[PDB]
């Protein structure tokens, strides 16, 4: 994004600061070391200026006739028509008949060298401690985000858009880290530098500092003007890049159709247009960022010219020594430095606080239900629904009065038009969503007045989307019960028809499924999932019979494996195969939600209507 509506800047920034709080010893040390390394960095050029004065008071002042004090020398400069040279002399510490006093210059530079060494050491140590504290807070922030992710209800992850939480948790924390490191280091250093340099300038002469500080409002106004002018040129670049990426991805994914239907020159023409349009906008944006870079340097150079000329005119009349103006020129450079960075500092700080607002509004949602501490013992699996009524959206209901009687060996099936929300019963059973009224009784107890670990560990699910994480095949199958030896995991991977494809692969049981996977065919992934489910020895199955890229060998393998998984378990099968729907007991059709039918396929075949024409 070019910018972002922050929607709160005081609360968010104070909340982030109190996040940084617990490392208060480290932050105090960082601040004190910064103050020290800045003081010793602004009291250096003053001592170098004293050394330059020691050189000047001797290189001009050894040529005067010896014997005279610095009143008769000045008067002799006057009488010979050198009034301004007389001013210059009367501003010095002349002793006629002298001229380098190199011991004093030696001692002055020896003092400055030690101060510079100490300042370097202090800056290094401050950098180390700042790094330590930034990492110590980022670790805890990420840990908090994770502990939250594992408590949010599924309604949260289902309501959000596609790929939004992943951005809330990945890129926003990086933005926060950048903002924190930048603000501490650069803002603290630059503000303290400006303050110390201003104090030193006031000590030297209160007029050239007037110049150096009257040049500031112009710098800030120019920065504001250029940023205000450049924002509408960043929104255009972001927009045009979005359009270009959209056209590219929709002409790359559908390339066979783009090509085989004729529209191969039209795609090139539209791309040429989008390419020109994104170049013409990237140019403007980059040019204006450029512009804001050296305009502040121009204004700083105007200030520096004014300082140089007026300082020369003041030293040349004996109102300021030469070391003072040398130190002042150094101070002018050090002061005009951060006025060029202010813009980028503000940009990154604003981006970071917007990201922090997003993350802290993620971290303020509500946790699911604080489940009861009672273990569930599903001895048989006789599920009984009791007047359940679900909504999915308070108001319009999806389920109505429902009284499933799922017996131990039963195979309750759900057949209907795909997209009718056929997973509502699945979500109700695993307790991903609470029921608004009713009672789901799993062999006496009800899934609401029991824990969730025990219940969900005594059910077991086999869904449409096969989930495999980065790791071996052995790790994925041991995910079902990660305290069983290779004997049990291999017995599981043999119960499902995995061992065959393991033999086919070069390094079976250590092949990374997603990393360099390549050939698992996404029909063997379903077998890995069935093995993972058969390892956890469930007692009450929830599972769907959908397919993907139907083969023959793998299709028969999946059918037989998922029919031997349902040995005696009570199953809530999302039936998409004729063999299973033929052998069922409480077939349900879902009319966009709304189970409205019933029957054992016999009274449902005599009164078929929707039933037979749907299962045809």
């Amino acid at each position: 994004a070019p910018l972002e509506r922050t929607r709160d800047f005081k609360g968010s920034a104070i909340r982030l600061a109190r996040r940084l709080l617990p490392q208060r010893a480290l932050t105090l040390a960082v601040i004190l070391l910064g103050v020290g390394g800045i003081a010793i960095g602004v009291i250096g050029p003053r001592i170098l200026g004293h050394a330059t004065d020691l050189l000047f008071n001797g290189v001009i002042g050894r040529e005067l006739p010896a014997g005279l004090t610095k009143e008769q020398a000045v008067e002799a400069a006057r009488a010979r028509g050198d009034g301004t040279f007389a001013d210059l002399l009367s501003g010095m510490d002349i002793v006629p008949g002298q001229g380098v006093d190199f011991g004093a210059v030696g001692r002055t530079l020896a003092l400055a060298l030690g101060l510079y060494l100490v300042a370097a050491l202090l800056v290094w140590v401050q950098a180390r401690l700042l790094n330590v504290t930034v990492q110590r807070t980022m670790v805890a922030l990420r840990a908090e985000v994770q502990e939250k992710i594992h408590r949010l209800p599924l309604s949260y992850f289902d309501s959000r858009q596609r790929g939004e939480v992943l951005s809330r948790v990945t890129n926003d924390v990086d933005n926060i880290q950048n903002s924190v490191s930048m603000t501490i280091s650069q803002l603290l250093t630059s503000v303290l530098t400006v303050f110390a340099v201003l104090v030193m300038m006031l000590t030297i002469s209160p007029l050239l500092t007037l110049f150096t500080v009257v040049t500031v409002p112009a710098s800030l106004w120019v920065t504001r003007w250029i940023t205000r002018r450049s924002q509408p040129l960043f929104v255009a670049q972001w927009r045009n890049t979005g359009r270009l990426a959209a056209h590219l991805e929709e002409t790359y994914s559908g390339f066979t159709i783009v090509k085989t239907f004729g529209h191969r020159e039209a795609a090139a023409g539209k791309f040429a247009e989008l390419n020109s349009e994104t170049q013409q906008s990237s140019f403007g944006a980059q040019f204006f960022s450029g512009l804001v870079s050296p305009a502040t340097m121009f204004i700083g150079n105007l200030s520096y010219v004014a300082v140089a000329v007026v300082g020369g005119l003041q030293v040349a009349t004996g109102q300021i020594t030469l070391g003072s103006i040398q130190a002042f020129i150094q101070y002018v450079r050090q002061f005009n430095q951060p006025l060029t960075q202010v813009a980028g500092m503000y940009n990154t700080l604003q981006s970071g606080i917007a990201s922090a607002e997003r993350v802290f509004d993620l971290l303020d949602t509500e946790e699911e239900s604080a489940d009861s501490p009672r273990r569930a013992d599903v001895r048989t699996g006789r599920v009984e629904f009791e007047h359940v009524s679900f909504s999915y959206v308070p108001g319009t209901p999806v389920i109505e009065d429902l009284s499933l009687v799922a017996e131990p060996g039963s195979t309750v099936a759900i057949v209907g038009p795909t997209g009718a929300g056929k997973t509502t019963l699945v979500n109700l059973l695993m307790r991903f969503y609470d029921v608004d009224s009713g009672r789901i009784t799993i062999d006496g107890v009800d899934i609401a007045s029991v824990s969730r670990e025990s219940l969900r560990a005594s059910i077991g699910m086999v869904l449409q989307d096969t989930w495999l994480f980065a790791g071996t095949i052995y790790d994925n199958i041991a995910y079902g019960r990660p305290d069983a030896d290779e004997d049990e995991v291999i017995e599981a991977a043999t119960a499902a028809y995995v061992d065959r494809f393991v033999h086919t692969l070069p390094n079976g049981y250590d092949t990374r499924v997603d990393d360099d996977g390549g050939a698992i065919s996404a029909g063997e992934k379903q077998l890995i999932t069935i093995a993972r489910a058969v390892l956890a020895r469930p007692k009450l199955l929830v599972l769907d019979e959908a397919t993907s890229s139907v083969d023959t060998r793998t299709e028969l393998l999946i059918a037989h494996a998922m029919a031997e998984l349902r040995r005696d378990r009570t199953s809530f099968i999302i039936a998409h195969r004729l063999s299973t729907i033929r052998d069922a007991d409480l077939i349900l059709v879902m009319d966009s939600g709304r189970i409205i039918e019933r029957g054992t396929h016999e009274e449902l075949l005599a009164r078929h209507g929707r039933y037979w024409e749907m299962t045809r």
Binding site: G262, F271, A308, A316, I329, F432, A457, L463, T552
Partner: protein, 573 residues
């Protein structure tokens, strides 16, 4: 490494004069920024050492001109640098796309529809950012360094060896620090990608994690990844901590030594004090410029790997191309005539097809049924020259398909691929890809023969329903029946249904098949399918197993004498 310059020399070639102007303006800007302190030194020598003050005012007038010149040159450099850095990047991503749109899906299957996109979108961005930063921030290092040595030689050539000893020491120290810092930086980036992958895998499977109750096992894994990334970031910052103090220490020790030796030189009437006032500025500016260059130099290996990717794309030569003399017939009949095709993949030893030979008559369908993995989609994609045969012939009623003007062929081909794709817009536009001038009745008949007019008639918008990016707002049957409608619009001579029927309801499957056989009577159809139910209606169903046509003939004769009957029929039914 060797490829980054290979394209960074070729695609910046038109903007040579722009980079020359950028360089000759940066030189002037930096020389003026260095010439301000020497006018200040001339103020202190010719001004406050004698009684002159008019000389101070004149030299102030000179400094005004110098700073105006500097700002003009700096703004010009910014302008031309931006112009060139966007021209290179408007040309790179266009030579990439004009290449990628010449592949043949056998050269595009190697990269993937997302790696291609990122290669032509963000890699060019990463190289263009490097060009921008190397025309606005890296050029100030050599210019300022050499100009500072020359300004010091001119000012007083007895203290320029302070520059000649202070610049190499700083450059060498920073080279050592950078050499030690780069590997841990790349490793930290890899660990960042690792933790992002952990988060993505935890968020995409938040139901499978909550089932199996494996939350305590997913917290430990993330804690491990987090602590590892933190340790790597600390070890990376352990050198950025050093990088700046070394610079400031070199500057300050050089300034102290400057005062000492310059005073020893002033004493013996060989210098003025303005030289002291100027050399401190020379030191500060030069060494800060070198520091900033070393800061920025950490961005190069990323550009190297991105340019490796882009060169990989721009290197793969294309095989399928229009012929030399495009023999063209008046009208493409469509009597496909495959004779002895193999199509061995680029790298493997297993010719997918082998000795394939059969003829589709002028108006009859032909189902190519076989094991999923025996290479039949290869056969379809060979008919419409997406892949190209390695040996054999692919006649289209007389002419080898490697001699036809490919646009003619593709204009006489109605293809329905395996997965359905719909482009962003209105359903009217997607259906407009077929005929390009479609009256409403035409779209309606093509949508009812596709069994898809129901959900596009029962919608408030009607025949303008908003379609998502890849038709993802629809689902399954909707998308495939919209693709079938798009193909039926054209009324081509050859309907190639790649699979096109598997992801469909069997009842509506029979409905659309019969609708076609009613409207597609005078045309050739070729259906590659695994399900046998859609195959009984064929006329010349051919079997394909392990790349051989083992079994040709009507479904009845085939079921009479072939293993296909037993295996496939008894496995399906």
């Amino acid at each position: 490494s060797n490829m980054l310059w290979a394209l960074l020399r070729q695609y910046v070639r038109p903007y040579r004069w722009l980079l020359a102007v950028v360089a000759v303006l940066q030189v002037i800007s930096n020389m003026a920024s260095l010439y301000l302190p020497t006018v200040n030194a001339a103020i202190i020598d010719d001004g406050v050492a004698k009684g002159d003050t008019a000389r101070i005012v004149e030299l102030g007038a000179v400094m005004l001109g110098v700073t105006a010149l500097q700002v003009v040159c700096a703004v010009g450099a910014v302008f031309f640098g931006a112009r060139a850095a966007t021209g290179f990047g408007h040309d790179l991503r266009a030579a990439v796309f004009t290449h990628v749109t010449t592949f043949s899906a056998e050269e595009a299957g190697r990269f993937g529809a997302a790696s291609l996109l990122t290669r032509t979108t963000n890699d060019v961005g990463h190289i263009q950012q490097l060009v921008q930063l190397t025309v606005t921030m890296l050029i100030t290092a050599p210019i300022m360094s050499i100009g500072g040595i020359f300004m010091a030689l001119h000012q007083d050539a007895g203290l320029s060896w302070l520059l000649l000893v202070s610049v190499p020491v700083l450059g060498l120290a920073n080279y050592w620090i950078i050499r030690h810092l780069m590997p841990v930086f790349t490793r930290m980036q890899s660990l960042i990608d690792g933790i992002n992958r952990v988060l993505r895998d935890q968020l995409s499977g938040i139901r499978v994690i909550r089932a199996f109750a494996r939350e305590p096992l997913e917290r430990v894994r993330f804690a491990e990844a987090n602590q590892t990334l933190s340790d790597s970031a600390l070890e990376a910052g352990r050198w950025q901590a050093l990088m700046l103090p070394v610079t400031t220490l070199v500057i300050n020790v050089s300034s102290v030594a400057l005062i000492w030796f310059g005073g020893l030189r002033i004493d013996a009437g060989q210098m003025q004090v303005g030289s002291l006032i100027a050399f401190l500025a020379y030191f500060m500016q030069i060494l800060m410029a070198v520091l900033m260059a070393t800061f920025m130099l950490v961005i190069f290996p990323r550009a190297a790997v991105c340019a490796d990717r882009i060169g990989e794309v721009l290197s793969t030569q294309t095989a399928i191309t229009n012929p030399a003399d495009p023999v063209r017939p008046a009208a493409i009949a469509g009597d496909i005539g495959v004779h002895d095709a193999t199509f061995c993949y680029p790298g493997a030893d297993r010719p997918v097809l082998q000795d394939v030979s059969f003829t589709v008559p002028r108006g009859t369908t032909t189902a190519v049924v076989g094991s999923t993995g025996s290479g039949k989609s290869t056969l379809i994609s060979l008919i419409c020259r997406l892949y190209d045969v390695t040996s054999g012939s692919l006649r289209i009623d007389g002419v080898d398909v490697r001699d036809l003007d490919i646009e003619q062929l593709w204009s006489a081909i109605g293809l329905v691929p395996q997965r359905g794709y719909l482009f962003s817009g209105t359903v009217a536009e997607n259906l407009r890809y077929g005929r390009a001038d479609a009256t409403d009745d035409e779209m309606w008949e093509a949508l009812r023969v596709a069994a898809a007019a129901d959900f596009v008639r029962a919608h408030p918008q009607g025949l303008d329903m908003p379609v998502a990016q890849g038709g993802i707002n629809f689902s399954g049957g909707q998308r495939q029946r919209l693709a079938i409608a798009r193909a039926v619009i054209r009324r081509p001579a050859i309907y190639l249904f790649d699979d096109a029927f598997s992801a469909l309801d069997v009842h509506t499957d029979a409905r659309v098949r019969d609708a076609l056989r009613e409207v597609a009577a005078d045309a050739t159809v070729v259906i590659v399918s695994q399900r046998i139910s859609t195959v009984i209606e064929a006329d010349q169903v051919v079997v394909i197993d392990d790349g051989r046509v083992v079994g040709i003939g009507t479904h009845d004769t085939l079921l009479a004498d072939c293993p296909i009957y037993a295996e496939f029929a008894e496995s399906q039914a």
